[PDB]
């Protein structure tokens, strides 16, 4: 399967460096142009750089000097080093294979990695569980107090995944706060357990939390 | 650089009508050869973006001939015949002609549905978040047609606003309804305090405001 998967990504701070990675896999890597375009909190995307098959390199000015692109053709890796990062700097970092066809164009794209600039120190988050006070019923998670983005959120591990969504992150006093909704038949609760994943990279957080019904 | 400007910023459509987003250049963007590099993605919510056009009217593998483009000079356009709730998502357009390689700010296109009220749930703090000496009561509105609705808080019946926290979900890929949550921020000694917490949702589908609420007694 044609694919490309990023890492690497987290909280750095200004000035300071951080090295992204991505693995690709079911194709020919070493034939192929490739590319970093980054897509910022404005949802503007950002070419960085690309560098062909040939090894020619060709870098957005703004990251010109401070930026390194590089390939490993033998493990299918292509690197991006960053030095001196700046606040801008901060975006999710996309991967893409560009296709050449006698022209061109980026026909693959991985899932991203997310990078934050900050002076900001990380604060892991505080995981609080939804419990109502007839058909369905709506429970949820509260995940407040965190930082930096993102944290992932799950419902029993990711098996119980109709019925939700997550609410986009606020920030307020420099930290993000957000919750999560699900709904199931309420024939099979408190019957069938629900419990909330909660996990956050950047302090290497990993909370699991029941949601009990309320009796008192 | 070449600037790439796209118009409208945001766009509402209904299911089975046609879309249209442009995008404008800085200048023309013909190659050497006689060809404009100008592609067109579109990314949908949590994905990565995709190639549904390029070079101006040609469709990428596994795109359906609902989509189409055309153009030249500096105006280009994009356009999608009847239009399924899935091509919900930003569109970009791109441009690898000049460098550097750069795209417009995107168009975020719609799904229009019949409206539809909010189901409201209210909740109450966690007795896990009252032992750290905070407390926070939640309130769900979801998937409810069109985004905009408003929600007042009242502890005891007397409306409260310092300290509320409103966000609200993209638009959803399946019933493309819209959810919100609203979020009263007070101390355990405050919250305590008081017993009778009532959220209500005032929407366009009603001019009676669908009330939720509950009180430490139970």
């Known amino acids: 399967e044609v694919k490309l998967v990023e890492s690497g990504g987290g909280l750095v701070k200004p000035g300071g460096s951080l090295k992204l990675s991505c693995a690709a896999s079911?194709?020919?890597?070493?034939?192929?142009?490739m590319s970093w375009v980054r897509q910022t909190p404005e949802k503007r995307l950002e070419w960085v750089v690309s560098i062909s098959s040939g090894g020619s390199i060709y870098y957005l000015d703004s990251v010109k000097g401070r930026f390194t692109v590089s390939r490993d053709n033998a493990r299918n890796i292509l690197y991006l080093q960053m030095t001196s990062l700046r606040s801008e700097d901060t975006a999710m970092y996309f991967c893409?294979?560009?296709?050449?066809?006698?022209?061109?164009?980026?026909?693959?794209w991985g899932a991203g990695t997310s990078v934050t600039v900050s002076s900001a120190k990380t604060t892991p988050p505080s995981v609080y569980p939804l419990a109502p006070g007839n058909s369905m019923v709506t429970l949820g998670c509260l995940v407040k107090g965190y930082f930096p983005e993102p944290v992932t959120v799950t419902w029993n591990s990711g098996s119980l995944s109709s019925g939700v969504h997550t609410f986009p992150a606020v920030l307020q006093s420099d930290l993000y706060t957000l919750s999560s909704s699900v709904t199931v038949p309420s024939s099979t609760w408190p019957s069938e357990t629900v419990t909330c994943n909660v996990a956050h990279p950047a302090s290497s957080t990993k909370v699991d939390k029941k949601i009990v019904p309320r009796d008192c | 650089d070449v600037l790439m400007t796209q118009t409208p910023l945001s766009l509402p459509v209904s299911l089975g009508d046609q879309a249209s987003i442009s995008c404008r250049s800085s200048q023309t963007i013909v190659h050497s050869n006689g060809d404009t590099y100008l592609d067109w993605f579109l990314q949908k919510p949590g994905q990565s973006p995709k190639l549904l056009i390029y070079?101006?009217?040609n469709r990428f593998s596994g795109v359906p001939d609902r989509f189409s483009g055309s153009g030249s000079g500096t105006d280009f356009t994009l356009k999608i015949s009847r239009v399924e709730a899935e091509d919900l998502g930003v569109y970009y357009c791109?441009?690898?002609?000049?460098?550097?390689?750069?795209f417009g700010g995107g168009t975020k296109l719609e799904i229009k549905r019949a409206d539809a009220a909010p189901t409201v749930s209210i909740f109450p703090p966690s007795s896990e978040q009252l032992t750290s000496g905070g407390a926070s009561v939640v309130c769900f509105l979801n998937n409810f047609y069109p985004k905009d609705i408003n929600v007042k808080w009242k502890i005891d019946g007397s409306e409260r606003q310092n300290g509320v926290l409103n966000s609200w979900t993209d638009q959803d890929s399946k019933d493309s309804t819209y959810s919100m949550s609203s979020t009263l921020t007070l101390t355990k000694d405050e919250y305590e305090r008081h017993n009778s917490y009532t959220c209500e949702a005032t929407h366009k589908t009603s001019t009676s405001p669908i009330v939720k609420s509950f009180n430490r007694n139970e």
């Open positions: 079911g194709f020919t890597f070493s034939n192929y142009a």
């Open positions: 893409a294979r560009v296709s050449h066809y006698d022209d061109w164009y980026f026909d693959v």
């Open positions: 791109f441009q690898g002609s000049h460098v550097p390689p750069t």
């Open positions: 070079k101006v009217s």
